[PDB]
Design an enzyme around this catalytic site. Structure first.
Site, PDB file in Angstrom:
ATOM      1  N   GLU A  39       0.827  -1.197   0.000  1.00 50.67           N
ATOM      2  CA  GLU A  39       0.000   0.000   0.000  1.00 50.67           C
ATOM      3  C   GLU A  39       0.868   1.255   0.000  1.00 50.67           C
ATOM      4  O   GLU A  39       0.568   2.229   0.672  1.00 50.67           O
ATOM      5  CB  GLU A  39      -1.010  -0.032   1.135  1.00 50.67           C
ATOM      6  CG  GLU A  39      -2.228   0.857   0.940  1.00 50.67           C
ATOM      7  CD  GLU A  39      -3.414   0.416   1.808  1.00 50.67           C
ATOM      8  OE1 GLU A  39      -3.804   1.163   2.737  1.00 50.67           O
ATOM      9  OE2 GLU A  39      -3.957  -0.683   1.584  1.00 50.67           O
ATOM     10  N   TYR A  76      -6.324   4.172  -9.519  1.00 52.86           N
ATOM     11  CA  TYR A  76      -5.792   3.963  -8.181  1.00 52.86           C
ATOM     12  C   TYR A  76      -4.585   3.032  -8.292  1.00 52.86           C
ATOM     13  O   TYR A  76      -4.688   1.914  -8.806  1.00 52.86           O
ATOM     14  CB  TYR A  76      -6.875   3.373  -7.264  1.00 52.86           C
ATOM     15  CG  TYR A  76      -6.409   2.922  -5.900  1.00 52.86           C
ATOM     16  CD1 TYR A  76      -5.966   3.836  -4.948  1.00 52.86           C
ATOM     17  CD2 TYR A  76      -6.425   1.575  -5.558  1.00 52.86           C
ATOM     18  CE1 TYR A  76      -5.533   3.412  -3.677  1.00 52.86           C
ATOM     19  CE2 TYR A  76      -5.989   1.123  -4.285  1.00 52.86           C
ATOM     20  CZ  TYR A  76      -5.544   2.047  -3.347  1.00 52.86           C
ATOM     21  OH  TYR A  76      -5.118   1.602  -2.093  1.00 52.86           O
ATOM     22  N   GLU A  78      -0.628   1.600  -6.580  1.00 52.85           N
ATOM     23  CA  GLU A  78       0.336   1.488  -5.484  1.00 52.85           C
ATOM     24  C   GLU A  78       1.515   0.621  -5.849  1.00 52.85           C
ATOM     25  O   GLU A  78       1.486  -0.075  -6.881  1.00 52.85           O
ATOM     26  CB  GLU A  78      -0.319   0.983  -4.190  1.00 52.85           C
ATOM     27  CG  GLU A  78      -0.984  -0.341  -4.287  1.00 52.85           C
ATOM     28  CD  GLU A  78      -1.867  -0.636  -3.085  1.00 52.85           C
ATOM     29  OE1 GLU A  78      -2.718   0.219  -2.772  1.00 52.85           O
ATOM     30  OE2 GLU A  78      -1.723  -1.727  -2.470  1.00 52.85           O
ATOM     31  N   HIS A 134      -0.650  -8.033  -2.752  1.00 52.92           N
ATOM     32  CA  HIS A 134      -1.745  -7.368  -2.077  1.00 52.92           C
ATOM     33  C   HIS A 134      -2.913  -7.446  -3.017  1.00 52.92           C
ATOM     34  O   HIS A 134      -3.003  -6.697  -3.967  1.00 52.92           O
ATOM     35  CB  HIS A 134      -1.398  -5.922  -1.722  1.00 52.92           C
ATOM     36  CG  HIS A 134      -2.549  -5.126  -1.194  1.00 52.92           C
ATOM     37  ND1 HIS A 134      -2.714  -3.791  -1.482  1.00 52.92           N
ATOM     38  CD2 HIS A 134      -3.583  -5.470  -0.397  1.00 52.92           C
ATOM     39  CE1 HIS A 134      -3.799  -3.341  -0.884  1.00 52.92           C
ATOM     40  NE2 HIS A 134      -4.353  -4.342  -0.227  1.00 52.92           N
ATOM     41  N   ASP A 168      -0.731  -8.901   1.955  1.00 55.99           N
ATOM     42  CA  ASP A 168      -2.086  -8.771   2.423  1.00 55.99           C
ATOM     43  C   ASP A 168      -2.944  -9.420   1.340  1.00 55.99           C
ATOM     44  O   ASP A 168      -3.207  -8.836   0.288  1.00 55.99           O
ATOM     45  CB  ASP A 168      -2.457  -7.311   2.683  1.00 55.99           C
ATOM     46  CG  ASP A 168      -3.962  -7.126   2.911  1.00 55.99           C
ATOM     47  OD1 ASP A 168      -4.614  -8.150   3.227  1.00 55.99           O
ATOM     48  OD2 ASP A 168      -4.494  -5.987   2.748  1.00 55.99           O
ATOM     49  N   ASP A 212      -3.530 -11.133   6.351  1.00 51.32           N
ATOM     50  CA  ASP A 212      -2.139 -11.023   5.902  1.00 51.32           C
ATOM     51  C   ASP A 212      -1.483 -12.386   6.061  1.00 51.32           C
ATOM     52  O   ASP A 212      -1.534 -12.963   7.146  1.00 51.32           O
ATOM     53  CB  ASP A 212      -1.411  -9.977   6.741  1.00 51.32           C
ATOM     54  CG  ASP A 212      -2.183  -8.640   6.839  1.00 51.32           C
ATOM     55  OD1 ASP A 212      -2.190  -7.855   5.879  1.00 51.32           O
ATOM     56  OD2 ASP A 212      -2.789  -8.351   7.887  1.00 51.32           O
ATOM     57  N   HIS A 252      -3.356  -2.746   9.590  1.00 47.95           N
ATOM     58  CA  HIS A 252      -2.811  -4.083   9.651  1.00 47.95           C
ATOM     59  C   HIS A 252      -1.561  -4.188  10.492  1.00 47.95           C
ATOM     60  O   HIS A 252      -0.741  -3.290  10.565  1.00 47.95           O
ATOM     61  CB  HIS A 252      -2.443  -4.576   8.261  1.00 47.95           C
ATOM     62  CG  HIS A 252      -3.589  -4.627   7.293  1.00 47.95           C
ATOM     63  ND1 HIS A 252      -4.190  -5.807   6.917  1.00 47.95           N
ATOM     64  CD2 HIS A 252      -4.205  -3.648   6.586  1.00 47.95           C
ATOM     65  CE1 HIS A 252      -5.135  -5.550   6.031  1.00 47.95           C
ATOM     66  NE2 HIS A 252      -5.170  -4.246   5.819  1.00 47.95           N
TER      67      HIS A 252
END
Ligand SMILES: *[C@@H]1O[C@H](CO)[C@@H](O[C@@H]2O[C@H](CO)[C@@H](O[C@@H]3O[C@H](CO)[C@@H](O)[C@H](O)[C@@H]3O)[C@H](O)[C@H]2NC(C)=O)[C@H](O)[C@H]1NC(C)=O
Ligand SMILES: Nc1ncnc2c1ncn2[C@@H]1O[C@H](COP(=O)(O)OP(=O)(O)OP(=O)(O)O)[C@@H](O)[C@H]1O
Ligand SMILES: [Ca+2]
Ligand SMILES: [Ca+2]
Ligand SMILES: [Mg+2]
Lengths: 260, 29, 371
Positions: A39, A76, A78, A134, A168, A212, A252
């Site tokens: 993230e 979006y 990351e 993730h 994650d 996770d 997390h």
């Protein structure tokens, strides 16, 4: 040799500017000789850059890094970020999962997993890989199932069986029910040991969820694992925090494992 | 000016350049 | 087949292309970055340095260097890097295979002009080259050979008068002020209103406000009044997080700084004055041509309604009955490039180049003569 994976909610310039929040991130990162941070919302690598400044402000080579371009199917985006201690491990080769073509990465993975060939002279495993994921919560079943194809690829490219897979995965509660475990080759297969259990709580919030995860394949890497060293890292208690503070670090907990 | 007046006229009278697209990367991210 | 090269390098942006196009092939920031920390991107091996556009996009793990200051080259080893990347990665050509026309700041110390030459012939082994003064080329781009040019790019603003294609050194005006500054103030003033412009991506958002919302007020007072009474020449701009915000008088306070350096505390005349100061410092006879020939070029000369203000400014300082004419071609973002491409493509100019032999047998000085 401690290994960890850590989803840091909206980790970016805003988080790193804040000094309380930055000391703690650094306090958590310094725990590990290899940490995957997820993230990463850092459009120009300024947050990343700020963190390494803190880790290397004394000895220049405390950590080195592996980082991705921003990934996401749509807008979006990351990045995956790997920090490691060069004096205990080195990186032989890295790549990104491309599903076998240029623009195929996103044919099954919203965030195309990054693969890292680490070299570890301190442990029973001499060379092994780490796969980072993730997942897209709304598609966790497929994405995790798809990590199996990624494992086959890692065998094909690197002729390596010893693989840690982690991140994650959103692998609990609403996102992956009991009945769905049977749809994930990564879990039903004998090749993989799932080190973080299902009853584990990897969230800093008041939800009890095993999101996770840390997964290992290949005798040498399995044998290296210190039994009972796979586990979530509850920094709230560890550091004696209030919830609000713990919460503003992330939602997390890192997942960690120790190798010998 | 080394061969100038002539060159001076070529500019005023004009020249027609052709089309190339451009990836101008001065948009601020 | 064997085409000439055109490379206009500025304080902030490099404009590179082929001689004859309309049409820079590449526009990218003029920055060199080096890794602050040891590591790699995925799939990729260690990088020694990032040039141009990957430099800015990975800023945060780098230390950046901007090799061109106020228009002039001040770091030579970074500028080679910038040219190499321009040649091989951006254009994908071999330098020894192409004649190359380079551009240059007004009042370029003679010493610099020589370095450029030696490096091109030596590091790059080019067969032919030429250096032309930026303003002089953007003036050609318009289709004249006499006139006054206002260069306003990223770090510098120039007033350069031209006769016969000769730049007139003794009369040039130089305001140490441009876009980067304009952006800065617009940041400072937006942060005044109660806004956060901390992040790199945010400090880059402000830059697009400038390019989208800013005009120049023909009359500043009326405009200040218009915004305080009618309260509706405000526009809006959508920030990244869904959040849009309203922009008002801030729109035209920013550009106005050019006419009033006093907004950032500079004991320099504004641009209307420095343009006047320039003209009444030339030969008396040719000034007629100069009033009727004001050509606008540079990034910071793109504000809707800047020309109009210039049009209605100098009228005041010009003799009461003078013919003031101001030309701002729509493509003037790259007016300087456009003119270089023109110059280097025209079969008549072919002689004016510098040969390989010519640099070897003469020296690095051949360029003061033939350019
Ligand atoms: C950096 O992040 C931290 C953690 O989120 C921020 O600290 C938190 O925010 C404010 C700081 O003023 C605190 O609110 C305060 O609550 C107390 C209640 O006891 C009240 O007495 C104060 O008047 C104020 O309302 C909050 O407690 C504090 N800590 C938390 C939530 O753990 C900090 O503001 C951020 N900013 C920096 C230093 O850049
Ligand atoms: N539409 C626009 N409105 C206002 N300013 C603009 C616009 N487009 C570009 N600019 C400004 O132009 C500047 C870049 O101009 P340019 O590239 O000609 O400068 P440069 O040649 O790199 O440097 P210099 O000419 O100062 O040596 C930037 O400051 C940018 O904000
Ligand atoms: Ca919990
Ligand atoms: Ca320029
Ligand atoms: Mg559970």
């Amino acid at each position: 040799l401690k290994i960890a994976a850590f989803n840091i909610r909206t980790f970016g310039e805003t988080k790193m500017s804040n000094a309380t929040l930055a000391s703690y991130i650094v306090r958590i990162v310094r725990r590990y000789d290899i940490v995957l941070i997820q993230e990463v919302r850092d459009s120009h690598l300024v947050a990343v850059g700020k963190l390494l400044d803190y880790l290397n402000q004394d000895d220049p080579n405390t950590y080195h890094y592996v980082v991705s371009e921003p990934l996401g199917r749509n807008s979006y985006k990351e990045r995956y970020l790997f920090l490691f201690r060069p004096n205990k491990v080195s990186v032989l080769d890295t790549y990104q999962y491309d599903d076998g073509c240029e623009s195929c990465g996103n044919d099954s993975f919203s965030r195309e997993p990054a693969v890292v060939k680490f070299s570890s002279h301190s442990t029973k495993v001499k060379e092994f890989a780490i796969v980072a994921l993730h997942s897209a919560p709304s598609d966790a079943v497929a994405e995790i199932n798809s990590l199996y194809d990624v494992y086959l690829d890692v065998q094909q490219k690197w002729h390596l069986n010893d693989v840690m897979l982690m991140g994650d995965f959103n692998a609990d509660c609403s996102y992956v029910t009991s009945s769905q475990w049977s749809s994930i080759r990564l879990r039903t297969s004998s090749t993989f040991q799932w080190l973080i259990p299902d009853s584990a709580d990897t969230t800093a919030t008041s939800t009890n969820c095993a999101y996770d995860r840390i997964v290992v394949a290949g005798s040498l890497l399995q044998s290296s694992v210190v039994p009972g060293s796979a586990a979530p890292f509850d920094f709230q208690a560890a550091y004696g925090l209030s919830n609000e503070m713990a919460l503003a670090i992330s939602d997390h907990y890192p997942v960690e494992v120790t190798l010998t | 000016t080394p061969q100038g007046e002539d060159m001076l006229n070529a500019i005023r009278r004009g020249v027609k350049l052709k089309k190339t697209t451009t990836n101008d990367r001065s948009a601020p991210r | 087949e064997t085409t000439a090269l055109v490379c206009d390098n500025g304080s902030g942006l490099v404009k590179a292309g082929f001689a004859g196009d309309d049409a820079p092939r590449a526009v990218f920031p003029s920055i060199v970055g080096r890794p602050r920390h040891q590591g790699v991107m995925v799939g990729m091996g260690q990088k020694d340095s990032y040039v141009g556009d990957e430099a800015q996009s990975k800023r945060g793990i780098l230390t950046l260097k901007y090799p061109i200051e106020h228009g002039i080259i001040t770091n030579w080893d970074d500028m080679e890097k910038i040219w190499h990347h321009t040649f091989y990665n951006e254009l994908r050509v071999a330098p020894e295979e192409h004649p190359t026309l380079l551009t240059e700041a007004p009042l370029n110390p003679k010493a610099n002009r020589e370095k450029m030459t030696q490096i091109m012939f030596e590091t790059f082994n080019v067969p032919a080259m030429y250096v032309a003064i930026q303003a002089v080329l953007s003036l050609y781009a318009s289709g004249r050979t006499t006139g006054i040019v206002l260069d306003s790019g990223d770090g510098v603003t120039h007033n350069v008068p031209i006769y016969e294609g000769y730049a007139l050194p003794h009369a040039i005006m130089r305001l140490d002020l441009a876009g980067r500054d304009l952006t800065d103030y617009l940041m400072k003033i937006l942060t005044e209103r109660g806004y956060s412009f901390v992040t790199t991506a945010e400090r880059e958002i402000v830059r697009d406000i400038k390019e989208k919302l800013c005009y120049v007020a023909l009359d500043f007072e009326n405009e200040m009044a218009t915004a305080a009474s009618s309260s509706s020449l405000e526009k809006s701009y959508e920030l990244p997080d869904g959040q849009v915000i309203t922009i008002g008088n801030e729109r035209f306070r920013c550009p106005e700084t050019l006419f009033q350096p006093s907004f950032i505390g500079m004991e320099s005349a504004g641009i209307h004055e420095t343009t006047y100061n320039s003209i009444m410092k030339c030969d008396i006879d040719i000034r007629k041509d100069l009033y009727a020939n004001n050509v606008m070029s540079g990034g910071t000369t793109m504000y809707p309604g800047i020309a109009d203000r210039m049009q209605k400014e100098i009228t005041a300082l010009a003799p009461s009955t003078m013919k003031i004419k101001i030309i701002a071609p729509p493509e003037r973002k790259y007016s300087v490039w456009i003119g270089g491409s023109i110059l280097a493509s025209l079969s008549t100019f072919q002689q004016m180049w510098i040969t390989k032999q010519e640099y070897d047998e003469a020296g690095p000085s051949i360029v003061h003569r033939k350019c």
